[model samples]
Structure formats: C-alpha cells, structure tokens
Target: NVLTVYSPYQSNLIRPILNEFEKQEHVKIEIKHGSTQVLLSNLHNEDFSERGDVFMGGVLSETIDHPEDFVPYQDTSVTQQLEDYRSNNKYVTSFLLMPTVIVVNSDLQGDIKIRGYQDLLQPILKGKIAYSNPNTTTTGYQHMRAIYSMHHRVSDVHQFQNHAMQLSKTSKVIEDVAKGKYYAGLSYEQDARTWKNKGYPVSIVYPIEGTMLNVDGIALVKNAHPHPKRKKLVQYLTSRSVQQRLVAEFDAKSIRKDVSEQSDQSIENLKNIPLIPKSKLPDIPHHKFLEMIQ
Candidate 1:
C-alpha cells in the first residue's frame, strides 16, 4: 500500500520517519510537502474524495475552516493532547505544539532587548520592525491572533499595531530582517533556526507576553485510500518514535500520552496567556493602524 501525507516538513525531518515506517510496515509512504498556506489551497482543490490519504501540517482553525476536506478519525492512540484546542474531535487531532516567536537580527543580538511582543515599540527599533500580514500569512495570522488571544484589552491590541510594519509575506519579513532591511519581525521557530544555521545572524525571541502557539493537527483526508496497511502510517504519526524525533531534530512539540517532555520546542517551557474571546481591538481599527512594509 502507498500512503500519502501532505505536510510542510523538511525531508530530513520527514524522510527518516517515513523510512522507518517503510521498514516497519513494508509499505511505501509518499509525502506531498508544502507550505502551510499552499497546503490549505491544495486541500481545497485536491481530488477531494480521493486526493490523498491524510492532510498534515495545519493549525486547528485553518483546518476547521475547510472541514469538508477531511474525515474525522480519533484513534485513542492520539490521546496525548493539550488544551481544549481541537476544532471537533471527529475532524482533527493536534500533534505538535509550537510557539509564536519574534524573528530578530542576530546582528543586533546584544543591542536590543526584545523580551516580549511589546518591546517592538521601543525607540531603538521604531520603524525598523516588520510584522507579517497576520490576515494573509499563516505566520502573521498566528502571531496576530496570538496578540488578540493574549488579552481582551484594547490597549494590547493597539500596542501591537502601533509597533508594526505589515508585510504580506512572512518570508519577506524574514529576508528583510536577514539583510538588515528591518531590525526584527514575527516568525516560526524552525524557520528562524534554519536561517540561523544558514549563516544568517538570525535568532528568536520567545515573547514574555505569553503569546499563542500554533497547534498543528493531522487528519485522514476525504475519500482517502483505505487499507489496513494504512494504519501503520497512523500509528507512526502518533507514535513516540516519530514524535520524539521531531522534538530532537526540529525542536517540535507533541501532544501524545507517554511521549516524554520534549527536550526542546515544547511550549510548556514557555508562558502562555489566554485567547481573546473577542480581542480588545476589532479588525477595523487593527487594519487602520497597519502600514505596508515598504
């Protein structure tokens, strides 16, 4: 049986696990790796009733937005869950818990004190910070929602807007920050780590504001191939074997019972604030304050 998984993970992080599953299940596993945004687009367009076996690599809300694209399957094996964050148990299950972070220019490592989200407003970095288009880019959307989710106060909402220079692309934020076009910007953990490894003086600021961390979910796709052999892929995804590897290799967090505390990438090590039932500042005022990153 050939299994297909659509998720935005590097082959290094992905291939090893698939290879192990291949060895363990003697089944061929095919990966349809993609960015979070495009993957959503694909789920909307893929051969709906039979495009792929499973859709992986998406946050809960995004997955919920396209509920028709998936079929719910809650194997008790996926019990290592956190927060009542899943959309509907029959539709999605979270596998990874990753923090929302500010992407900083390691070039200014000691010069700036970016202890939290509010620190961007400081004069030293004024007009220099680029914020992602939270409405458009998953990165921005997550962080922007993180801001909103952190508090019900309009003050915190306006505070984040007051300090932002919006960009439609989170990668643009990363690139500009990488070239010093901007001082810092919002980003994902693995991206910052990848840039840092690529010789870019890039590092992350795990905000003290207790920001929102993305909960990535996995689900069987609509009309996917059904084979008893396919169960290995499910077991592999929820297994301690694959979960621990993500923790060690990508600093990723997992919500599996018996899955030990991640040595790294676990949001449990960081502070988390409550989400905005309706964030203080509504979308209109929030957008009014945004200035495109020029």
Candidate 2:
C-alpha cells in the first residue's frame, strides 16, 4: 500500500519519524514537499491521482481554501488533551503550535529598540527589515495578519496591503536575518532559536500587541487510496510519546498538555506574550490580501 504525505517544511523534520514507522510497520511512506502555496495549488490543479493520503504542515489555514477535498476525522477521546484551538477530527489534527517573532540583529542596531510590530515601520528600518513573501510563505502571511491586528483601525485587508509594502523592500527574510544583512525579520520562533543555537547574532522580539500562533496539522484525504497502516501512523503522530520526541529534538511546542512541559524555553516564553487565538484566524481572508502583493 502507498502512503503519501504532503508537507511544507524540509523533509528532514519528519523523515526520522517516517523511517521508524517503516521499520516497524514494514510499509513505505513517500513525502512530497513544497511551500504551502505550492502544495495547495498542486492539490487545486491536479486530480486525485496526484494528491497524497495526508497533508502535513503548519498552515491549517489552507484547509479552509479547499475543504471539499478533505475528510474530517474527529477523535473525541483526545480532545481534552489539546488546546482549545487544536482540531480533534481525523480530517485535521494539530500536533504542535508556535508563535511568530521578529528576529533582529541586536549587535548591528545597538540602542535601537524594536519591541512591537509598528517599530519595524520606522524610517531607520526601511531597507533593514525583511520578511518572506506572503504569497508563498505561511509565516509571512501570519506576520501580515499580526501587523494588521495591531493597527485596529483599517480593515484587516488594508493592513495586509500596507505590510506588504514593508516586506517588498527586503532581499531575503530568513537568510538576511541570520547573517545580519537585514536588521530585523519576521520568522518563526523555532527558526530564530535554531539560528542562535548555531551561533548567529540574532535576538527574538515577541510583539507586545499579540503574535500569531501557527498550528501544524495532519489531515487525511477524503477519497484516496488508503494504506492499512494509516490509522496507526496518525495515532502515533498525535500520541504523547511522539509529541515529546518532537519537542526534545526539534524544539516544537506540543498541543498535548502532557507534552507541553517538554518543549524548549522559547515555547514557555510564548505564555508571557499575548497570542491571537487560532479560532479567529479564518475571520481574515489572507488569500485575497496576498494577491495584492504582486
């Protein structure tokens, strides 16, 4: 039986778990990788033949774009273990959650403070700020949302358009932030932490207004070829044991209360920073806003 999984991040993050599953279940797992937009577009353009058995990624927002293609499987037994924002159904289940942050090169911009979202818009930071393309990157989209949330006067759509202007001037979001080429960048907390662990001159700023929390979820295809071991793999991925491993190895924040304490310090820091609840994420239509970027 074929088991296909579509993911946005590098295959390296999930490969180890798949390898272990293959060893135990004697089933082959194939991973198809691409950015969130690429994968969503592929699913939108292709027939069921090209679709995977499961879509695994941090951007659950895409599901709202194509709900007809997914089959929901809610596991009520484990609902209590998850945060209120996490989904329980088999159609989609959030395993980990994390906040986006402004990663800055502290040494380069000594004395210039960037404590909130609006600070990035300062004239001094015009060419010094960078962000991934929101049209393609989920983190970029969330970053736009966070900024829009801060403004509070203009509609969310207008905020996105405004923020896009700020991001368009940057060269590269992640790379520039790591090398001190850009004074600040909007990126995931774990990404910034990983860079610091590798000796990069970067510091994280959890925007005071409220940061967007990214939920990484797994969803089963509504009508696709099924592997006999599919249930086992899903169960294993959402189990407390595997969640702890994800935290210990990759610094991810598990949704399960039993596994939350195992996460890295960055995850703990999220508690102090205001966070936008995931339930309200859909209220803002990011796709329409992203179209204005180009």
Candidate 3:
C-alpha cells in the first residue's frame, strides 16, 4: 500500500520519520510540498482524486474552511496528551503550536521597547515595522486578525488601511526580512529564534497584550486512494513516538503535553499567544485572494 502526504514546509523535518515508517510498515510513502493556499486550492479543485492521503502544515483554519474535503480521524493512542483547544473531533488534529513574536534589530533600534500590538502604532516604529501580506500568507492573516481583535475600539477602516500601508512602506516581509532594510518584523517564534542564534542582532518580543498561536496540523483527505493504509499512516504520524520526535528535533511545539520539551528555551519563556478564531475574518474566496496578492 502507498500513502502520500501534502506538506507546506520543507520535507527535511519529516523525511527521517517517513523513512523509519517505510522501513517499519513495509509500505511505500510519497510526499508533495507546497504553500498552504496552493495545496488547499488543489485539493478543492481536484476533488481528492489524485490528492495526497494526508495534508500536513500550519493551515488549520484553511482546512476547516473546506471541511468537506477532509475526513475526521482521531488517534486515541495519544489523544489524552494533546491540548484541548487543538483537537476538534478526530478529523483535524494540531501536531504543533508556535507563538508568533515581534522580532526587532536590537543593535540598530537602540533600547526601544515593543511591548504590545499597539506599540507598533507609535511614531518610533512607524517606518520600521514589517510583516507579510495578510491576504496571502497564514502568518500575515493571523497577524491582521490579532490586531483587529486587539483594537476593537478603533472603528475606522481607514486606520486599518493606513496600518497596512505603513507595513508596506516600512519594511520587506519575506523570509529574510532583508538585512538592514527594516528594523522589526512579525514572525514565528521558532524562525525568530533561529535568526537570533545565527547572530542577526534580532530580539524577539512576545507581545504583551498577547501573541498569535499557530497550530500546525494533520488531516486525512476524504477520497484518497488506499484508504485503509492512509488511515494507518495518519495513526502512525499522530502516535506518541512521532509526536515526541516532532518536538525533540524539529523545534516544533508538541500538541502532546507529555512529549518532553523539544522547543528552544527562549520560546518556552515567552507567553502563549491566542489565535483569533477563523470565523471572525472575512470569507476570502479561495484562489481569488492568492491571485490578488501575486
């Protein structure tokens, strides 16, 4: 039997585990990688005819938005160990959770403090803030939602529009965040820690008000071939052993509380940011949002 998985991140983190699974199960396994929006659109259009058996990435809201394309399957082996907020029925389960942080170039910015979401609105950080486009990236959208939730008192859409323009003009929000082009950025805790470790002079500030918590998840496709084996593979990936490996080596937040800490110590110290529920955001019509961004 063959099991295929569609993933968002580079396969480096999961390759070794997949190899071990292949050796143990004696079944062929294949992987396909792409951005969350791309994979989600493909699954929607292709109707799961040739889609991978499971979808794995940090796009839980996107998957829930199109639940008809997925089937719920809970692996009871380690179910009791996971956070309650991360699990819904058995169809979709969060495997990892990472808090988003505001990263700044401490050397360039002096001892300036970035305490909360509103702090970014101050004049000191006006021309220095950078973030990915909300319409296109998961982090981008999450950040936008976080701001809206935090600033419910502000009723003007223009304020939001101005903030977007400010983000666009101030800095580049891609993977690197440019070297010296910007002073601060909105990014994941793990990525920020990696950059700081590489001697980038960046300091991560877990927002005082709260940070966004991103949950990377796994879900079975509704109409995958080799259904039985696909179910088996899902069971394998969600097993206690696999969850432990994800935390121990990948720097990912384990959904299973029992998994010994694999996250960087810096991350553990930061406060846990709450994620905005998907229902609050506008219903972005699938590919249209991606096309506009591109």
Candidate 4:
C-alpha cells in the first residue's frame, strides 16, 4: 500500500521519522511538502490523483476550522495527553505542543525591556517588528489570540498591529529577527531555539502575561486513497517513540504525558495562557479581526 502524506515540516525534522515509518510499515510513502497555507489550499480543491491520504503538521485549530477536508478519527493515544492539549473533536490527533514566544534579536534589543505582548507596541519599535498575517499563518493567528486574551479591547489590538510589520510567511518572522532586519517577532519557541542553536543572535521570551500554547496535530484527508495503513501513520507519529524523538531532537515539546522536555527551556516552567475555548476562536471572524487590527 502507498500512503501520501502532506506536510509543512522541513526535511531535517520530518525525514528521519518518515524513513523509520517507511521501513517499519514496509509501505511506500509519498510526501507532498509545502507551506501550511499552500497545502491546505491545494487540499481544498485537489484533483483525485493529487490527493493525499494523510495530513500532518497542522495546528489543531486550523484542522478543526476546515472540518470538511478531514475525516474524524477517534485517537486513543491522546488518552495520556493533558486534557487541555487533547483534541476536543475527532477530526485530528494532537501530538506536539507549540507555545508562542517573542523572538528578539539579542544584539538589537538593547534598551527596550520587552517582557510581553505589551512591549511590542512601544513607539521605538515602530517599523522594526516582524509579524505574519494573522489570517493565514499559524504563528500569526496564535499571536493574535495571545494578545486578545490579554487585552480584549479592539483599540488595544490595533495599537499592537500599528507598530508591527506583517509578513506573508512564518519562516520570515524568525529569519528577519535573526538577521537583525527586525528587532523582534512573535514566533514559536522551538523555532527560535533552532535559530539560536545555529548561532543566530536571538533570544526566546515566554510572554509575562502568558503565551498561547498550541497543539500541533495530524489527520486523515477526506476521501483520499483508502488504506488501513494511513491510520497506522497517525498512530506511529504519536506513539511514545516518535513523541520522545520530537522532544530530544526536534526542539519540540510532546503532548504525551510520559515524555519529558529535553530542552534547556521547558514549557512546564512557563506560564502558558489557557487555550481560548474552541467556540470562541471563530466567533470573531479571522478576517473581521484582521480588518480591525490592520
């Protein structure tokens, strides 16, 4: 059986896992790699031959938002996951924990005391901050959610947006900050860790008011090639072995209760903002909120 998996993860991080799975399952696997937005757009209008059997590297919120594109799967592996991190619906299975953080160019953030979401709005930071468009990028949407949780007023959200420059891709947020093109950007802690480990001048800050702790997940694409092995891919990705590997090697935090964080900076030690209830996330239309902020 051949399994087609759509993913946004870079090769260095996802290749090893897929290679291992290919060997264990003795199944041919085809990977369709692209940005999350591109992959989602393609899935929404894909022709039969181009369809993928499994979708990986999706944020749970994004997967839940596009219910028509994915089939429900009651994931048993998540039983050991934290209740807050568990999928409220059957459409996707949570495997990784991604907490949003501010990535500051260590050399550039000289006198500014950037402690939280409040710091990004400083007058001095105008034209110097990089943010992804909230309507499209996962990091961008999560950042908006993080700020909204702290300050519910529309004016407060606008104030933050005015001082920030929006980019089209999430990768640009960290890359710009590392090159000192932008003083700071809102991004995932694991991403900043990667840049830092590569000798980039960046520091990761868990917001003082608490940051959005996101659940990254996997799901089966609707009406794709029928293969029992497709579900095995999901189970294999969330299994203890894979989850632990994600923590130790990928700079990611695992949802599994048994895996301990191997990073010097641990999410357990940070004050993560509670996930906004699923019902409330779409209540404020993403585009409507974008209009308010932009």
lDDT of each: 0.67, 0.70, 0.64, 0.78
Q: Highest lDDT among the candidates is held by which one?
A: 4
Better candidate by TM-score, 2 or 4:
4
User: How should the candidates be ordered by TM-score, best one leading?
Assistant: 4, 2, 3, 1
Looking at model 4, report the run of 10 residues with the lowest lDDT sum: 269-278
What tens digits encode model 3's per-residue C-alpha lDDT throughout 1-294?
Answer: 567888877788788888897888787778888767667778778755676687876656433557888887666655445454456546776667677777777766777667766776677766566777665567766565566555443232235435533343112452345365566778777677666667677777766755666767788887746446666766676677887777666656666666635445443522233444445443444344334333
lDDT of 3 at 249: 64
- Candidate 4 per-residue lDDT over residues 1-294, each given as its tens digit: 678888878867788889999999898888888877678888888875567798888675443446788888876656787665788767888878777889999898889988888888788988899888877787888788778767576676667778899899888899999998999999987789889998999998877765677778888888746667988888888888888888777667777767744455644532233444444444454445666666
Off by over 4 Å in 3: 153-161, 164-178, 260-294
Judge candidate 4 at residue 84 and give its lDDT: 57
The TM-score measured for candidate 2 stands at 0.86
Per-residue lDDT tens digits of candidate 2, residues 24-143?
888889988987667867876767766777777766644347777777776664664655656734467776777788888977878887887777767777667777766667877777
Off by over 4 Å in 2: 88-90, 153-171, 262-270, 277-282, 289-294
Ranking 3 against 4 by lDDT, winner: 4
TM-scores, one per candidate:
0.79, 0.86, 0.81, 0.88
